[PDB]
Amino acid sequence: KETAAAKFERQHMDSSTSAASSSNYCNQMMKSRNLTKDRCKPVNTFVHESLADVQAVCSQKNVACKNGQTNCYQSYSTMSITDCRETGSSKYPNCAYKTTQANKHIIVACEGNPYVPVHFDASV
């Protein structure tokens, strides 16, 4: 019965690789972090930075969330990210994903004590 913090870590942290090497990256990770479970999640980002590097973003540039909440934060620097997106071919439980590897800034929603990332709002 996962915390919000632990859930974000399971969804979004990939500190083990520096980048998506393969086109297959999304397919394996989405399945592997248990995200194709009941359904094919349409979009999920994975962050190839340290967990402390991503926790620090909660203290960077404060922006609106796309929900117009005001507890989101843009990283000052770019970061290695893998964007995973369902193709139109895709058919649950046979989820298929297009892998895009980029260096982008991330925007996260933080909460709690400690104030850590609980949502992945977007990358820019």
Ligand SMILES: Nc1ccn([C@@H]2O[C@H](CO)[C@@H](OP(=O)(O)O)[C@H]2O)c(=O)n1
């Ligand atoms: N750019 C984006 C946009 C959405 N998402 C995923 O899609 C969801 C929004 O519907 C996110 O939920 P969380 O912010 O709870 O992680 C997230 O896990 C993402 O991972 N990257």
